[PDB]
Amino acid sequence: AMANNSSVANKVCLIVIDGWGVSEDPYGNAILNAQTPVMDKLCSGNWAQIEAHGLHVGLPEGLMGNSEVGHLNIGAGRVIYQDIVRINLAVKNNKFVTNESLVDACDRAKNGNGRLHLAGLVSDGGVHSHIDHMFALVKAIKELGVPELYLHFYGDGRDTSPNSGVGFLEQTLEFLETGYGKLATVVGRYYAMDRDNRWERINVAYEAMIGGVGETSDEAGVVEVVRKRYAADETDEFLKPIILQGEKGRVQNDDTIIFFDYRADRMREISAAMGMDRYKDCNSKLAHPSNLQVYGMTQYKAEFPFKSLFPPASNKNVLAEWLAEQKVSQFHCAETEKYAHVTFFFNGGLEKQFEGEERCLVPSPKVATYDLQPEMSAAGVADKMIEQLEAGTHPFIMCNFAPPDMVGHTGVYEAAVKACEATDIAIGRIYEATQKHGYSLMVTADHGNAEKMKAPDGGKHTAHTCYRVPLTLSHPGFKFVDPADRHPALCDVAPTVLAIMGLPQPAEMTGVSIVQKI
Amino acid sequence: AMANNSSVANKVCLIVIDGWGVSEDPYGNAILNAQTPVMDKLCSGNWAQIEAHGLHVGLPEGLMGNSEVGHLNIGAGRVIYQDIVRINLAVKNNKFVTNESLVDACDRAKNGNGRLHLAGLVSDGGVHSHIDHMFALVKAIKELGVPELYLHFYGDGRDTSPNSGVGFLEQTLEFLETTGYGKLATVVGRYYAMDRDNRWERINVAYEAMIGGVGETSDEAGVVEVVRKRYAADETDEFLKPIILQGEKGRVQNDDTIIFFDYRADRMREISAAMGMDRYKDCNSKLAHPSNLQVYGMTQYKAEFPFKSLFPPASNKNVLAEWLAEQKVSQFHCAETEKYAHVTFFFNGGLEKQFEGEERCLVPSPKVATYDLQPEMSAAGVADKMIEQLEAGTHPFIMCNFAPPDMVGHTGVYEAAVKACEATDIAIGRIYEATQKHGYSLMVTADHGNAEKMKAPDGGKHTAHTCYRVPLTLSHPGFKFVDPADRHPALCDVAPTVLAIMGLPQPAEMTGVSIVQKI
Ligand SMILES: [Cl-]
Ligand SMILES: [Cl-]
Ligand SMILES: [Cl-]
Ligand SMILES: [Cl-]
Ligand SMILES: [Mn+2]
Ligand SMILES: [Mn+2]
Ligand SMILES: [Zn+2]
Ligand SMILES: [Zn+2]
């Protein structure tokens, strides 16, 4: 128990059903078709339906939700953005020109020797990078007034077929006359983007960038150089270096460099060769430049000192942390299959247990597949939550219910039906104890699943869905309201909890409470 | 980092493959049939095959392993038993006579009014209890010299047939006259004694039979005839209304002591709480509640109860993670999401505690509907993180789990299971190469089998774990495997062996043995 447990206005019990979405279509919908009298009552009158997929939860548009994202967003009281979504939003919304690390890098160049470099995979493959990110960067760098910009083009031959490079090269050249920036290197990813510690490969790109070791060319003719490579059966992935500009186009002493790939695994070696001691591993006859600073689109290794344009989200003052800071104790409970989700992920994506936080794990059943015991261990989770309600120790308690997602993944419709009936029973037992012991009950889900067990052709559908999830509230003194500018979403669950409890909301929660007092 | 990291003789990398068993049968064997050159080499020459099922890992005889049992036993360096196994062993090896809580209860009776009660379900059902356990308690209590012992018989009709109770009753009566000691005091159906839905009006019937003799009077000579008459009236074992023997002397009285012998908690919480706490209020009984009772349970029924238990939960002190921290040696635990709990909560002894110097790493599992769509799962990422720790050299003990063989094995797709095992072997190869570059000894084991048996005999899918042995490998050529003196080697021997290789002391709580020998 924590010192301020008494100051709380309302004690709250939060049930996160796993894989329970709202769909009015009955075909293969195990939730609609199950006997679910408890949720039928809670999901009536004052209840909301909130988004748990796509950009509402920080995922690419149209992509289904999942347990890790779902619990992260539920616990955070804000949208947790996947890296790609963050960068594409920055491009769409012209946010690079005020990006803290990009501004820092351009200030560095401006107060120094004026020289900046851009390096990465240049194609529309979208696995490691996108040319659109490089274009957005060039435009921002120009607007920020950097004197000299050079581009190092790593040719793509795996994510964009082996003969498209000549087109991305032509596109880049045409782009640059913008009227700003100069192409300095072309080399295949086989050399620049090795991830198997074959530093003799890395050395070709390192020497190309530092020393101009390669075939000399200029903007005029560079496409013909590449065509000559194609005719000799040397494709994009494997292009040996082509050198444009002269020493001025090389990565020199005091220069600043930005890698624009957002996937770390194939950038660790080249970035480390430029900005740390791995140049020693290259065995280059060239001298390593002094006083370089390297920036990455994202964090490539925690051990690296490089600043990142989009570093890992700090995720400060998630609900669990804020309650501890407010001196309010809490309880998190799940069975084994979702135990990590209510702990590691619910608490912001890190291994941390906060002062006053008590955790409880219920063993999952030992069966080959969960359709053989569709009720799983929902009953035992219910037992532990009822025990906490009778104690009354913790003003905020929460649990996860596993059956709908885990049985949903089997594709067995009748098993999913039994799973939803057992889950509804457990919810009813918790609800009756909340009403006897003075807790307000909120039921949600992290994403849907069991409401869609059949594909259109009548076969199994074993995946999560994009349907909305419920949000219920037993307290009669509140009414659900929508946000001003967007649909309600999981980021709004935690702000709302705090409102009911009568606690302050931290600035870091950019979600909003979606209830009003009445 | 930690202060004695440099004192270790050998740094150890422990890989726990999930669901990788040893079977020579090629039929449906995705492990054997997959291309696995790395594990084929590690599992040659000096290597061992160790047990991961049944009593070797604390489970009932013949029962397959699972990830919680396996990671518990691997982490603990001892057999982590299941309540049932512990009690059955105690009966076989005459250990009730020296059970600490049983002796406490018998000393209480002996120093007090001399009166002790046994209460539970009397049948061979084996779900909630076993009559063999009750007989063993009678024999031990007699040997301990308790003056008076009374038995309260809850009739079984759910875990055994509805008209079998007369046999268990006859058996019990003959048994008591074989011990010249102990008296049957009550017969009442589990419908009353063993409710688990808070129907306190049912609990009260049993409570009043035990406390005040509310029921039908009988004696040893008559009880069988009474029960048979119940049967003729369509009242079977589960629903027997109370039968009262010995009169008041057989009742639960002031200052009496009572032992419940069921090992399953869910149906004992109500009657035991009625006797030993405040739920007698809920019974609304006409009888006064007795003063100064003491209640003992076969096992712990609820943490909130003050009751001593004959077999309380394992303390699990000085598991490997705690012991390494106590020796001021740092450590690293890594897994992907599906097995992250197993390398943390379970590996460390079944609790939420992170010890000083322990660094943890969770690798996201792939977001696919079912894992046969990406059978390599995230084995490569786990390997990337282990290789980063091996290059750093910070932690003298590092360990990881590889999920694919178990999780893909559960899909029953043979070719996907094969791909899972090939990816697992590749990841192992990359780790092995890192341990040789950076001066670690490599040990590979598994928590139980799965993928070595993907097809049932009829050609259908086999999605379950198995009872096959698992490997234990060691790259250090200074040691040879040696079997234990008195049993097959098992998962409980993995942790002691690690310590032996690292040159560290072994805590007394690790009752496993190192199964290597210095050369
Ligand atoms: Cl790739
Ligand atoms: Cl933040
Ligand atoms: Cl039962
Ligand atoms: Cl112990
Ligand atoms: Mn799922
Ligand atoms: Mn398994
Ligand atoms: Zn989920
Ligand atoms: Zn396992």
Q: Which two tokens stand for residue A7?
A: 């100051």
Nearest one of A279, A306, A301 to A290, comparing CA atoms: A279
Surrounding ion ligand 2 within 5 Å at CB are: A 314
CA distance B515 to A117: 58
Burial grade of B298 (CB within 10 A; 0-12, 13-18, 19 or more): buried
B175 close to B138: Cβ distance less than 8 angstroms: yes
Judge whether A464 is closer than 8 Å to chain B, CB to CB. yes
CATH architecture of A1-81+315-518: 3-Layer(aba) Sandwich (3.40)
Instruction: Give chain B's length.
Output: 519
A334 close to A18: Cβ distance less than 8 angstroms: no
Q: Name the DSSP letter for residue A247.
A: G
The residue among B352, B359, B454 with the most chain A CBs within 10 A of its CB, best to mutate, is B352
* CA Rg value for chain A: 27
- Strands B479-481 and B115-122, bridge-based pairing: unpaired
Judge whether B108 is closer than 8 Å to chain A, CB to CB. no
Active-site residue, B67 included: yes
Half-sphere exposure of A170 (CA within 13 A, CB side): 9
Nearest one of A396, A402, A311, A322 to A362, comparing CA atoms: A402
CA distance B331 to B309: 35
Judge whether B359 is closer than 8 Å to chain A, CB to CB. no
Could you write out the DSSP letters of every residue in B144-166? TT-SEEEEEEEEPSSSS-TT-HH
CA distance A456 to A28: 10
Note whether B410 contacts A369, CB cutoff 8 Å.
Answer: yes
CA distance A260 to A298: 8
- Look-up of token digits 């990110």: A133
Q: Name the DSSP letter for residue B254.
A: T
Which amino acid does the sequence have at B393? G
- Look-up of token digits 């009550």: B186
Shortest Cα distance, chain A CAs vs residue B136, angstroms: 30
* CA Rg value for chain B: 28
Residue spans of the domains in chain B: they are 1-81+316-519, 82-315
Q: Beginning with the edge strand found earlier in the chain, give each strand of the sheet holding A256-259 in spatial order.
A: A215-216, A242-243, A182-188, A148-155, A115-121, A256-259, A293-296, A307-308
Q: Helix, strand, coil % (nearest 5) of chain A?
A: 40, 20, 45
Please list the active-site residues of A: 67
Selecting from A368, A387, A463 the residue whose C-beta is nearest the C-beta of B464 gives: A368
Does A18 show up as a binding residue in the annotation? Answer: yes
CA-based nearest residue in chain A for residue B450: A368
The residue among B72, B362, B365, B462 with the most chain A CBs within 10 A of its CB, best to mutate, is B362
Q: Beginning with the edge strand found earlier in the chain, give each strand of the sheet holding A357-362 in spatial order.
A: A47-50, A469-472, A439-448, A11-19, A396-401, A330-335, A357-362
Method: X-ray
Residues 6 or more apart from B388 whose CB is under 8 A from it? none
Note whether A66 contacts B367, CB cutoff 8 Å.
Answer: yes
Judge whether A361 is closer than 8 Å to chain B, CB to CB. yes
C-alpha dihedral (B238, B242, B244, B249), degrees to nearest 10: 100
Judge whether A387 is closer than 8 Å to chain B, CB to CB. yes
Selecting from B341, B370, B410 the residue whose C-beta is nearest the C-beta of A339 gives: B341
- Look-up of token digits 């005889």: B61
Selecting from B68, B360, B463 the residue whose C-beta is nearest the C-beta of A368 gives: B463
Chains A & B: contacts with CB separation below 8 Å: 40
**Which residue positions of B form the known binding site?**
18, 67, 128, 158-159, 190, 196, 264-267, 339, 406, 410, 447-448, 465
Q: What CATH number labels A82-314?
A: 3.40.1450.10
CA–CA–CA angle B80, B85, B89 (5° rounding): 110
Half-sphere exposure of B152 (CA within 13 A, CB side): 32
CA distance B360 to A399: 24
Nearest one of A327, A358, A293, A268 to A117, comparing CA atoms: A293
Does A416 show up as a binding residue in the annotation? Answer: no
What are the chain B neighbours of A339 within 8 Å (beta carbons)?
Answer: 341, 345
Does A196 show up as a binding residue in the annotation? Answer: no
CATH architecture of B82-315: 3-Layer(aba) Sandwich (3.40)
Judge whether A139 is closer than 8 Å to chain B, CB to CB. no
What are the chain A neighbours of B340 within 8 Å (beta carbons)?
Answer: 340, 344
Q: What is the largest CA-CA distance in chain A?
A: 82
Question: Ligand 5 centre from A467 Cα, in Å?
Answer: 14
What are the chain B neighbours of A359 within 8 Å (beta carbons)?
Answer: 352
Judge whether B43 is closer than 8 Å to chain A, CB to CB. no
Question: Ligand 4 centre from B351 Cα, in Å?
Answer: 13
**Which residue positions of B form the known binding site for Mn(2+)?**
18, 67, 406, 410, 447-448, 465
Residues 6 or more apart from A183 whose CB is under 8 A from it? A150, A151, A153, A172, A173, A176, A219, A222, A244, A245
Of the ligands numbered here, which is closest to the C-alpha atom of B401?
A: 8
Residues 6 or more apart from B101 whose CB is under 8 A from it? B296, B308, B309, B310, B312
Secondary structure of residue A269 in the 3-state scheme: helix
Of the ligands numbered here, which is closest to the C-alpha atom of A401?
A: 7
CA distance B505 to A257: 51
Residues 6 or more apart from B236 whose CB is under 8 A from it? B157, B162, B163, B165, B230
- Look-up of token digits 């501890």: A324
Judge whether A265 is closer than 8 Å to chain B, CB to CB. yes
CA distance A470 to A401: 14
Shortest Cα distance, chain B CAs vs residue A409, angstroms: 7
CA distance A192 to A205: 5
Q: Measure Cα distances from B405 to B20, B142, B251 in Å.
A: 6, 53, 58
Q: Measure Cα distances from A81 to A78, A85, A314, A448, B70 in Å.
A: 9, 6, 12, 20, 37
Which amino acid does the sequence have at B492? C
Question: Ligand 4 centre from B58 Cα, in Å?
Answer: 13
Shortest Cα distance, chain A CAs vs residue B232, angstroms: 38
Question: Ligand 1 centre from A169 Cα, in Å?
Answer: 22
CA distance B415 to B33: 10
Q: Which two tokens stand for residue A76?
A: 């955070």
CA distance A388 to A400: 15
Topology at the third CATH level for domain B1-81+316-519:
Alkaline Phosphatase, subunit A (3.40.720)
CA distance A139 to A133: 10
CA distance B20 to B447: 8
B144 close to B111: Cβ distance less than 8 angstroms: no
Q: Name the DSSP letter for residue B108.
A: H
Question: Ligand 7 centre from A343 Cα, in Å?
Answer: 13
- Annotated catalytic residue within B7, B23, B44, B67: B67
Q: Which two tokens stand for residue B435?
A: 């341990």
CA-based nearest residue in chain A for residue B463: A368
